Write a protein that binds this ligand. Structure first.
Ligand SMILES: *[C@@H]1O[C@H](CO)[C@@H](O)[C@H](O)[C@H]1NC(C)=O
Lengths: 211, 199, 229
């Protein structure tokens, strides 16, 4: 048994936002909805399909019919930006099931293209017989970006680790990607390049062993 | 030892359907033959299981829900029915594997002048889910204007009493019901028939 | 105040075992079904186990069936999770949670509704040893950082374990323009992160920039000056 949610849902402040939750004969069970802000525990915002716990704002409503439960937030506000999970406790087996979650973004500020800075391996690290390229991406909104590495327009296969976007102090987001190389393969290509894609717009930055 | 079915079926007092009583039965030898060989049961419908081969199988748990309704409402203690009882009092799931047992209790639950202890739920804002039970006495609003004290414009108390008199029609006489649900987990099976591999 | 407090997490080696506690206070604990739910880093909520108000019935998720044991001491207001044969994919924050429905005690009936109370969580990292301090390398500001209004410089903190490493700049004197990133977990099992500061191009001659790295568990402290060499 699986409960399947939309991965992401964005909404302007004040607009109505809806998150769906689909499962087999889900109408025949009760659905719960939980809100989780970053680095906080979950909180119950809807239970018994549609009931709202004590102290939960009235703009949170919920429905469940057929195979679809729906969490609705009318007049969506900045402080509602969070991950939302649905959950169902099967009346049989007494077996709990969460949804995959939904990242509700509240568009609170305008679009911002990322600022990409590519660092070649430090000479200390080279003297230590390793080489790490560092691609730092900063000052972008929304916080969603993809990274791609290349050696001379040829796409790099492995040795890449990339962070998920994180809020900086100015409420924008930043991410980092690292490419590991032996100093041989560092020195043995003309250049390396980091390609960063943000809302359909791609920017790349390049370094060379010479420069 | 012998599973305490005696205490469930021969229970001196029974529960109102709206507040149906559940007994989990565990860690005993269940002689189901003692039940289906008491030919005093007016209803004995089993779904998904053998009649007698239950006497050979083992289960993690056996749950016995029990209550009192009127005779013509017994047909509602079955999968996918509607009606006052199945909608507002005791709903069975569609995939129900287990047994429904009922018998006439006129000589025990009716009394001359009328018995008004056995209740049922008349009004609810929506249907019960399978194996759900509701015992709230919240004032039901059918009208538009809120009630907060006792009653106003369409503000009914949600429970109603059966009036069980010995001279009621058979359809309006009290029947005692016991619903056995069987549970088999990835865990020790504690409720076993005497003809099992275990003994 | 209703309160759930998890404890007993930490770093532990795979195949070993570990016992988590959850302390309840401010409600009649003995009358509520209880849950264990976990969340791996950057993943969703995973149900782990559930136990009846009296401990009679216990249900587990398939991923932990046979390996974990849920239990409760109702006299001591406590919920326990015994985790045995820990795999690496068990690394997660473990929350205990209370169901909003309470049994009156009279007839073995329970229906689970929403989980209205949650603890703050306890973190369990299951990794194969290798508790080392990091190597800190400077990320010098280049000539293409120089030609904007401002320029970027940073510190690479590589190959460390366990998870908590703190990074400041100039003993905390330098605060604005600074983003320190979350760490990546390399397949090697060691963590690695970067800290960066945007800074006026023309100040690269006058103002010195040192990054201070503190890895408590290995008792490591490193200051590294970032020059534009
Ligand atoms: C209940 O009482 C009757 C009285 O004859 C007895 O035969 C029966 O075994 C007892 N137990 C059950 C299961 O009814």
């Amino acid at each position: 048994y699986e409960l399947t949610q939309p991965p992401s849902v964005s909404v302007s402040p004040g607009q109505t936002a809806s998150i769906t939750c689909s499962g087999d004969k889900l109408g025949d069970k009760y659905a719960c909805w939980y809100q989780q802000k970053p680095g906080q525990s979950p909180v119950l915002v809807i239970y018994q399909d549609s009931k709202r716990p004590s102290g939960i704002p009235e703009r949170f409503s919920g429905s469940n019919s057929g195979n679809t439960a729906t969490l609705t937030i009318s007049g969506t506000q900045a402080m509602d930006e969070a991950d939302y999970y649905c959950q169902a406790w099967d009346s049989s087996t007494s077996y709990v099931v969460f949804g995959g979650g939904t990242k509700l973004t509240v568009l609170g500020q305008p679009k911002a293209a990322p600022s990409v800075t590519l660092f070649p391996p430090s000479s200390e690290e080279l003297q230590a017989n390793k080489a790490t390229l560092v691609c730092l991406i900063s000052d972008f909104y929304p916080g969603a970006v993809t990274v791609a590495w290349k050696a001379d327009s040829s796409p790099v296969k492995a040795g890449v680790e990339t962070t998920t976007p994180s809020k900086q102090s100015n409420n924008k987001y930043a991410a980092s990607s690292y490419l590991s190389l032996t100093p041989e393969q560092w020195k043995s290509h003309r250049s390396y390049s980091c390609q960063v894609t943000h809302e359909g717009s791609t920017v790349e930055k390049t370094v060379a062993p010479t420069e | 030892n012998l599973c305490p079915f005696g205490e469930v079926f021969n229970a001196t007092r029974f529960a109102s359907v709206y507040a149906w009583n559940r007994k989990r039965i565990s860690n005993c030898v269940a002689d189901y033959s003692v039940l289906y060989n008491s030919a005093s049961f007016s209803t004995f419908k089993c779904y998904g299981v053998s009649p007698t081969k239950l006497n050979d199988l083992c289960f993690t748990n056996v749950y016995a829900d029990s209550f009192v309704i009127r005779g013509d409402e017994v047909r509602q203690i079955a999968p996918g029915q509607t009606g006052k009882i199945a909608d507002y009092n005791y709903k069975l799931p569609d995939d129900f594997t287990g047994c429904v047992i009922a018998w006439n209790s006129n000589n025990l639950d009716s009394k001359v002048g009328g018995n008004y202890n056995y209740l049922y739920r008349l009004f609810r804002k929506s249907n019960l889910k399978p194996f759900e039970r509701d015992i709230s006495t919240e004032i039901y609003q059918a009208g538009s204007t809120p009630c907060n004290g006792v009653e106003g414009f369409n503000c009914y108390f949600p429970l109603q009493s059966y009036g069980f008199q010995p001279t009621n029609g058979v359809g309006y006489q009290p029947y005692r019901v016991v619903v056995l649900s069987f549970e088999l987990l990835h865990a020790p099976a504690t409720v076993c028939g005497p003809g099992s591999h275990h003994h | 105040e209703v309160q759930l407090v998890e404890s007993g997490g930490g770093v532990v080696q795979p195949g070993r075992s570990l016992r988590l506690s959850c302390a309840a206070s401010g409600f009649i604990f003995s009358s509520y079904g209880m849950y264990w739910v976990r969340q791996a880093p950057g993943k969703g909520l995973e149900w782990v186990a559930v136990i009846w108000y009296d401990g009679s019935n216990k249900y587990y998720a398939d991923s932990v069936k046979g390996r974990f044991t849920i239990s409760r001491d109702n006299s001591k207001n406590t919920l326990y999770l015994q985790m045995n044969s820990l795999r690496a994919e068990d690394t997660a924050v473990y929350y205990c949670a209370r169901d909003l429905s309470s049994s009156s005690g009279w007839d073995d009936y329970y229906y689970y509704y929403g989980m209205d109370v949650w603890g703050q969580g306890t973190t369990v990292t299951v990794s194969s040893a290798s508790t080392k301090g990091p190597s800190v390398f400077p990320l010098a500001p280049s000539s293409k950082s120089t030609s904007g209004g401002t320029a970027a410089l940073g510190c690479l903190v590589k190959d460390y374990f366990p998870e908590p490493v703190t990074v400041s700049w100039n003993s905390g004197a330098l605060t604005s323009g600074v983003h320190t990133f979350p760490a990546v977990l390399q397949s090697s099992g060691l963590y690695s992160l970067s800290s960066v500061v945007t800074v006026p191009s023309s100040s690269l001659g006058t103002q010195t920039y040192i990054c201070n790295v503190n890895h408590k568990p290995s008792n490591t402290k490193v200051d590294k000056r970032v020059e534009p060499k």
